[PDB]
UniProtKB/Swiss-Prot annotation, chains A, D, F:
Periplasmic topological domain: 38-40
Role: Antenna complexes are light-harvesting systems, which transfer the excitation energy to the reaction centers.
SUPFAM superfamilies in alphabetical order: Light-harvesting complex subunits (SSF56918)
Recorded GO CC terms: plasma membrane; plasma membrane light-harvesting complex
Residues that hold a bacteriochlorophyll according to the record: H13, H31
Lineage, broadest ranks: Bacteria, Pseudomonadati, Pseudomonadota, Alphaproteobacteria, Hyphomicrobiales
Protein's cellular compartments: Cell inner membrane
Keywords in alphabetical order: Antenna complex, Bacteriochlorophyll, Cell inner membrane, Cell membrane, Chlorophyll, Chromophore, Light-harvesting polypeptide, Magnesium, Membrane, Metal-binding, Transmembrane, Transmembrane helix
Domain of life, source organism: Bacteria
Name of this chain's protein: Light-harvesting protein B-800/820 beta chain
Species of origin: Rhodoblastus acidophilus
Swiss-Prot record, chains B, C, E:
Residues in the Cytoplasmic compartment per record: 1-14
Subunit structure: The core complex is formed by different alpha and beta chains, binding bacteriochlorophyll molecules, and arranged most probably in tetrameric structures disposed around the reaction center. The non-pigmented gamma chains may constitute additional components.
Topology of this chain in the membrane: Single-pass type II membrane protein
Family: Belongs to the antenna complex alpha subunit family.
GO cellular component annotations of the record: organelle inner membrane; plasma membrane; plasma membrane light-harvesting complex
Record's protein name: Light-harvesting protein B-800/820 alpha chain
Pfam families given in the database record: LHC (PF00556)
InterPro entries for the chain: Antenna_a/b (IPR000066), Antenna_alpha (IPR018332), Antenna_alpha_CS (IPR002361), Light-harvesting_complex (IPR035889)
Length: 40, 46, 46, 40, 46, 40
């Protein structure tokens, strides 16, 4: 590919940034389930 | 968040799969670590 | 700081992900080290 | 890509340089949290 | 110092990140070495 | 990229060469801090 317009960039990143939170959230569940059933 | 203009500098067609890959790699590493410096991980698999 | 003109010499589209990658790599290394030359890191995971 | 104009270079680097400090700062917190709860 | 004309032979856009990378690599190596042939480095992390 | 004119080469290298000294200097501090607090 190529770079993006400043507009389509910012609009991609919107998605990159929910991706992440979806991750994070699921992580949290994990880490807690972990934390929970675990010597840690 | 504040950083979306990076795709104006870096071709998401290479850069995204980059990020997502390094995540996948990182998670295996972190597993690998914990697996080899606890007993209780490995214990789990038994 | 004083060094921004480097992107006039080096295509940030290759150079930035370079920097950011070497950071990510470096942090895993430094973890890896500390993990394998203390007890207290590993202790932590137990 | 390609290189940049001297103007758009310096303007990129502005961002590279907050990136870094954001890092640094968070590092500091880390190193202190570390330092704190730790034999180091 | 005397050597600047090298960029007339070698495209700083590949050559600079080369140098800077080999520095970064070298420093990790030298750390790695010292870490694994003293006690006092590792001692430090405890 | 491409190679450089003999003029823009020499002018790049000016920067390569402060980079280095900045490094060196900081190294020196390191090596001394080292030297100082250390069995070496
Ligand atoms: C080690 C301590 C605990 C434990 C505690 C935790 C904690 C705490 C966490 C996890 C997390 C996860 N663990 Mg664990 N977990 C344990 C044991 C296991 C076991 C096992 C059988 O041993 C397995 C299989 C898993 C599995 C998992 C995942 C479901 C999840 C991480 C996802 C990840 O990012 O994948 C990525 C890696 C891959 C290999 C998946 C790749 C699949 C896709 C198809 C490929 C992506 C493509 C990519 C390369 C790029 C493509 C880009 C596009 C083309 C543009 N766990 C032990 C018992 N686990 C993490 C999680 O919840 O994440 C939020 C987390 O925080
Ligand atoms: C070892 C001693 C202590 C401790 C002390 C410290 C100290 C001290 C510090 C950290 C730091 C960090 N530690 Mg630690 N920490 C410990 C144990 C852990 C554990 C664990 C389960 O063992 C984890 C998961 C972490 C996690 C972390 C991170 C949150 C953070 C470093 C971030 C980094 O740069 O990531 C980068 C690496 C990755 C794998 C992340 C990659 C994710 C993204 C999506 C990919 C980036 C993409 C890149 C490749 C290029 C793309 C460019 C664009 C496309 C253009 N620590 C132990 C207990 N920790 C550092 C921090 O605070 O940083 C400021 C720090 O200073
Ligand atoms: C081993 C003996 C002593 C000690 C004695 C010394 C001495 C003596 C020195 C150092 C030096 C350094 N040490 Mg030490 N130090 C010790 C323990 C540590 C610990 C640790 C937690 O164990 C850490 C994290 C450090 C950290 C450091 C660095 C701050 C510094 C080297 C910088 C370097 O070149 O990075 C580069 C490597 C990286 C991973 C950084 C990369 C970051 C950037 C973003 C990437 C650059 C990009 C590159 C790949 C190319 C891009 C080019 C452009 C795109 C064009 N030390 C022990 C206790 N240390 C050296 C220093 O002062 O240097 C002058 C030095 O001389
Ligand atoms: C027994 C359970 C184990 C354990 C087992 C595992 C396993 C297994 C996994 C994790 C996972 C993670 N663990 Mg853990 N984990 C443990 C305890 C910890 C500890 C701790 C010190 O207590 C820490 C700090 C962490 C931290 C983390 C995360 C770094 C990571 C999940 C990412 C996430 O969702 O981010 C969500 C993203 C965010 C919300 C981003 C926010 C960005 C902010 C705002 C910062 C800006 C960026 C900044 C400037 C840095 C620039 C980075 C550049 C690329 C260099 N865990 C214990 C010890 N953990 C998972 C993982 O690492 O996935 C790869 C995983 O698979
Ligand atoms: C600095 C403050 C700015 C900001 C500045 C930057 C900068 C600068 C950069 C990013 C970068 C990123 N940011 Mg941002 N960013 C911000 C806000 C966010 C938010 C948000 C607030 O919701 C999200 C989802 C993201 C998402 C992202 C990722 C897509 C990307 C790399 C993440 C990563 O590696 O972090 C690494 C993770 C951390 C250092 C923190 C570790 C995760 C947290 C701390 C703990 C996870 C909890 C875990 C589940 C449980 C742990 C339990 C144990 C007790 C510890 N940013 C704010 C507005 N952002 C990077 C980028 O785009 O490069 C490609 C980058 O360089
Ligand atoms: C138990 C706790 C452990 C430990 C665990 C960890 C872990 C875990 C991590 C760190 C991290 C870091 N640690 Mg530590 N750390 C410890 C103690 C130390 C000691 C010490 C000797 O006491 C040192 C020197 C450091 C130093 C560092 C940094 C190099 C690094 C965070 C980068 C940062 O935010 O920069 C912010 C950036 C700056 C502000 C840049 C300033 C630039 C200046 C002006 C210099 C110009 C550049 C110069 C010329 C060099 C050119 C470089 C070229 C590329 C070659 N830590 C103890 C022993 N530390 C993190 C890391 O390395 O991330 C990858 C990380 O994940
Ligand atoms: C406990 C402390 C440890 C130690 C821990 C570390 C750590 C940790 C690091 C160093 C670092 C360095 N150490 Mg030490 N170091 C120790 C003791 C020494 C000893 C010694 C024999 O006593 C030596 C010779 C060195 C030498 C060096 C440097 C090579 C390097 C810093 C580079 C620098 O700033 O250059 C500045 C640059 C110059 C001014 C250049 C001058 C150029 C001249 C004019 C020559 C022309 C070039 C010539 C023709 C060669 C061509 C090269 C081609 C590419 C092949 N240290 C002790 C044993 N040291 C750092 C390092 O290597 O960084 C990667 C680093 O991270
Ligand atoms: C050894 C040891 C102990 C190690 C431990 C140490 C360390 C350092 C551990 C480290 C832990 C860390 C830091 C972990 C990291 C966690 C992080 C995890 C991140 C996760 C991110 C995820 C899952 C991201 C997901 C994102 C996704 C799926 C993206 C989706 C986006 C799309 C589908 C885009 C949609 C297209 C759109 C609508 C925008 O539209 C399109 O725009 C284009 C231009 O913009 C146009 O050309 C095109 O015509 C148009 O169609 C954050 O980064
Ligand atoms: C084994 C062992 C013991 C090892 C230990 C040893 C060693 C050596 C350890 C080493 C430790 C060290 C040195 C660690 C390093 C730490 C450092 C960490 C650095 C972190 C940096 C980070 C997180 C950087 C983040 C930067 C980011 C996210 C950048 C953002 C920038 C953007 C989004 C750009 C915005 C675009 C902009 C607005 C400028 O605009 C655009 O400009 C272009 C041209 O310029 C135009 O063409 C385009 O049309 C336009 O849209 C520093 O480097
Ligand atoms: C196992 C074991 C024991 C191992 C130990 C052994 C060994 C061998 C150990 C080795 C140790 C050694 C030798 C270590 C090495 C140390 C060294 C370290 C070096 C460090 C160097 C550094 C940090 C360099 C930094 C340089 C930087 C940041 C460069 C900056 C330059 C710029 C920003 C350029 C500015 C652009 C400019 C103004 C010139 O302008 C531009 O010019 C172009 C053409 O010229 C034009 O086309 C463009 O339009 C215009 O804008 C030296 O090299």
């Amino acid at each position: 590919a190529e770079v993006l317009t400043s507009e389509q960039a910012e609009e991609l990143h919107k998605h990159v940034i929910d991706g992440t939170r979806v991750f994070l959230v699921i992580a949290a569940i994990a880490h807690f389930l972990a934390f929970t059933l675990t010597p840690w | 968040m504040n950083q979306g203009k990076i795709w104006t500098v870096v071709p998401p067609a290479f850069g995204l799969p980059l990020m997502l890959g390094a995540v996948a790699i990182t998670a295996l590493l972190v597993h690998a670590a914990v697996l080899t410096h606890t007993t209780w991980y490995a214990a789990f698999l038994q």
